[PDB]
Amino acid sequence: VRTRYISTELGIRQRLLVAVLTSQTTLPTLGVAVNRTLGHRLERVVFLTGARGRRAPPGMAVVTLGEERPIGHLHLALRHLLEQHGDDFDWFFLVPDTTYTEAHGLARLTGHLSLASAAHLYLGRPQDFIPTPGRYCHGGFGVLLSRMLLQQLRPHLEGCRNDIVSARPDEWLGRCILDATGVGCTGDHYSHLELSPGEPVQEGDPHFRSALTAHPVRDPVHMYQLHKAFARAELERTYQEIQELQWEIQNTSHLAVDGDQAAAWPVGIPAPSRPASRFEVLRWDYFTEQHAFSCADGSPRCPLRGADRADVADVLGTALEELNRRYHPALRLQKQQLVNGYRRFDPARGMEYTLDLQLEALTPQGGRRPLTRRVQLLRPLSRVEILPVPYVTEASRLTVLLPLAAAERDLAPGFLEAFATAALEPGDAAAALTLLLLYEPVFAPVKAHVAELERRFPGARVPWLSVQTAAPSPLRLMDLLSKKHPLDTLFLLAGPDTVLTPDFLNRCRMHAISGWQAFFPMHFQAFHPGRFDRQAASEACFYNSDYVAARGRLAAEELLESLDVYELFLHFSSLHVLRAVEPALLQRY
Amino acid sequence: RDFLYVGVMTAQKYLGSRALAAQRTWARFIPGRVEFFSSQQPPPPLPVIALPGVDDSYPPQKKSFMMIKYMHDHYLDKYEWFMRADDDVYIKGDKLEEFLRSLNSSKPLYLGQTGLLGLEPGENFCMGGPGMIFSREVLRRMVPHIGECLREMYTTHEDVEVGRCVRRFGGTQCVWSYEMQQLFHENYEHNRKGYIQDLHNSKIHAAITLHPNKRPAYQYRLHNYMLSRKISELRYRTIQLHRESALMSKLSNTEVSKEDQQLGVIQPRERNEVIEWEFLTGKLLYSAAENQPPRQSLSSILRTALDDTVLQVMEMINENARLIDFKEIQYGYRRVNPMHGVEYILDLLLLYPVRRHAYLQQLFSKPFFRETEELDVNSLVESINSHNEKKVHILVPLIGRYDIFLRFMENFENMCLIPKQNVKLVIILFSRDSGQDSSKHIELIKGYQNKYPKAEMTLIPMKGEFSRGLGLEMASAQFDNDTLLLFCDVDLIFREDFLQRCRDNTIQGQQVYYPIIFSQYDPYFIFSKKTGFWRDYGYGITCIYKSDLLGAGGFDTSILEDVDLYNKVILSGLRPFRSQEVGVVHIFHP
Ligand SMILES: O=c1ccn([C@@H]2O[C@H](COP(=O)(O)OP(=O)(O)O)[C@@H](O)[C@H]2O)c(=O)[nH]1
Ligand SMILES: *[C@@H]1O[C@H](CO)[C@@H](O)[C@H](O)[C@H]1NC(C)=O
Ligand SMILES: *[C@@H]1O[C@H](CO)[C@@H](O)[C@H](O)[C@H]1NC(C)=O
Ligand SMILES: *[C@@H]1O[C@H](CO)[C@@H](O)[C@H](O)[C@H]1NC(C)=O
């Protein structure tokens, strides 16, 4: 018999389960703080509370126990941990809400014991009893029980509950463990951190480097600060590990096939891509501190705007900080000027820089001397993350619109033919066209074409309305169309010069998320009776509800008259405004 | 560090070839002690154990038995797991440590890939290639009968015999699970050569032990790749820690630090601020930037990056296992934020034949830093308390054009000679019809020569028809291979900024400067749409070292020549530095 997974064959259980003990009052604040500081770094977290006062917080495995007395609460928590879960985990961590958990340190600890050796373990901070020389673990510092210990403890829970008269619950647990199995609290190492009352969290303290619990925590803010400090400590540890790995790669590089490729700065990051042909070379984008000379507009130079300027300033600051750190304390650098600035994006490596800085050197005595240095910065590409996105179905009811003006009657048949070949000819009635007539203060061919389409495709139906009002302002017409339409239809605002294709229809259907995103493509402009125009909105793919919300935000007349629908969604909307190129949309004039 | 003890078997001919590599490759990451075993000899590069009565004879039969006997007799109670492995195997210490820690060492476990002689069907043996791991109990129950197993030898395969010994004494067979074929990879169905070549396979990433690795250099390459993967994982961990710190400071009603907000990122309003996306089909790319051409073919760099991204997506999608398979990309989108990361929208065609979107994101980790030329800090401070750069040789091929010549040299003298810039000017003049403008050019050159007697101005009387390549080649041939040569043009005007950029951007043996010359439109340094445009297709101007030019093979002198030199430079391994050049503008000419 053969299995698809090792877990079934070898009986592999999950590593660790954390059982946070809380109460009715301490759940919505301290339990939530514990969840936000621990649950996203672990696998399974179970919250045990005596009673459920309010509704269970979302994403919180809250379990109602029944009693608030600490001894009975612990007894019922152990009963639940044995009945449910139970023989599914190798280690159980019982920790009160008032104790921060390091998560990473706890996982490292649990991975640092073997099943064969620590079969029956009672882990925690030892504490003296109050004749037996055994010691029990302090409740506030977390207790890491073993599965076998819990199984042997099961038939003694009620016996321990009904005989001894201890006050503290952790002392009761220690007494029960001692009287049932005989093993006390083992100190190993369990790196515990104790906090004096009313203490300020001092980041960078040595005790933050090696500690898996912190007791006592009385407010969620204190827990949050402790978690931030421990995150800083773990970050420093990770930086040290990265340095060690880089050193090992540098040591073993020159014996490998890659050689210089393996030992290419920075050590560990993928080597720069080697172009195969002339066209595949990567061009450095020159920029000064004021203007960028590689403009997507087309101009030879253009002042740095937004993202580019912010990136340049950040890179200059990083370079100055790194130089000051490297030359400290012998030399401190001064006001920095960017003589030459280069930047290219290497898809397999990351964004690269090559700066030529005109720095100034200040000796501690006070000497002044200008200095010119060249530095290189690389932003490595990290792992790929799949962003969550609302589910969108391929088959969506789409309503393509057309504000057919007076002068576009000649070109209207081309749009009608394109729409027919794109949606009406396929059997599925996935699209419907509701064109508008701008009867400015005589369109028989358009109605005849619509009737011909209706007769040729009996299922297809195309309506039309006669806007007598002038002022064809995109917003105005869009409000009228939105008013005379349902609030959940998918809107495809297509200009007269749009040649629809089934591929573009599918892309609009599956990239216009209701209430999450609006799709604004850019067509393929061509010269002479090509280019991707970036200043033309024209085609728009959004939803009626989103447009109504944007119009309400606008309301809360000059903007209504001189605002584009794309500009409206840009300003008065918090929706993704994806502006991508469409090769399937060809335009010409 | 008493968890895992792996004893790797070697041979006298493999001590300095595979044993040393394995000691410097994965013995430094095994959570425990790694000991090398060889045959008895009548200064080895490695500390090795010579098992008595053992000879280097393939297959390594009874050598594994002796090494297991040594394992039990020396470190039975000092370790929980014992691994028998060949020298041509790669073992990942951390993954194996977690996988073994998820197991009970006190139960008899005989791990390894299933092997499918004298096998009555129903039993099996762990294959000796990927690596077979025993437990303490298996050792304790088997090793008293190793001699008995050796005296009942049936087959000529060592791993079959070891599995038979385990089954006869140890109460265990090899693991039957199909997951072993992935964890302990054999890498023999493909890659027949015998050394890992394709490193970007999901099988390589998901495996624990990789075999075979006969070539030591490829073993080092695989080790470097694995360490690079570990570094990338650690960088992602740093990004996650920064995100957590930023969120945690937000919760505590405290201002986030600068290092935690840029890396802790989870409407643009203005029209020219939204970053446009690019269409990515299976083998074509469409862009909206003026610099990029629409419908450009998908570059090999872009193809490799997309393949790696799709591989990562498949790895992080099949983590919930059914087995998802990737076929092709119907279309895609890409938006490169310079300071944050890269956003993808891939419409994959996955197989469980169902399409699935993926709004990917590839953030940037903490930027790295390096100074190109480190300086002596100690020697600098004493100097502070208390033009002589690299000479640029200007080569100017010529034919006629008296007025442009005079304008060029007026600019050259005004910008170099009076400032005494460290340059050498070489005038390559083609004496068309053997005279005519040559005499006046010589007179002007001589007058400018004695006007500035410290200047370096030389004219070479070329003959024959017009040829940029031939004149440039013979002008260069008189200079040594450590000289900086500039392939300047007569109808050009430049300042010292261009000279400094040429000096810095040209690395002897590594980099070639290939500026994008600004060509003035038909009616100065003011850059405007009407004034001129960037000549992307112009590779005429070059700042290249003589040795680099010789290595590129020089000009063909048969025909466009600049494009051929660019291609030869690319093929030679040099790095072409293509970028804008704001220090020199090409004056218009009919
Ligand atoms: O004459 C020999 C050949 C090989 N070996 C060792 O025996 C093991 C089996 O060799 P290898 O892994 O190359 O065989 P493969 O697994 O490729 O069949 C390795 O540790 C070799 O170093 C040996 O001791 N003597
Ligand atoms: C608890 O944590 C989980 C994941 O760690 C999260 O999804 C959930 O929103 C959290 N609940 C609260 C109330 O913070
Ligand atoms: C490991 O196995 C031994 C014997 O099979 C057993 O006594 C021991 O309890 C097991 N360890 C655990 C953690 O169950
Ligand atoms: C000059 O250096 C180049 C570098 O590749 C070499 O090819 C060439 O032979 C050298 N010439 C002399 C004369 O040393």
Ligand SMILES: [Mn+2]
């Ligand atoms: Mn082998």
Ligand SMILES: [Mn+2]
């Ligand atoms: Mn010219």
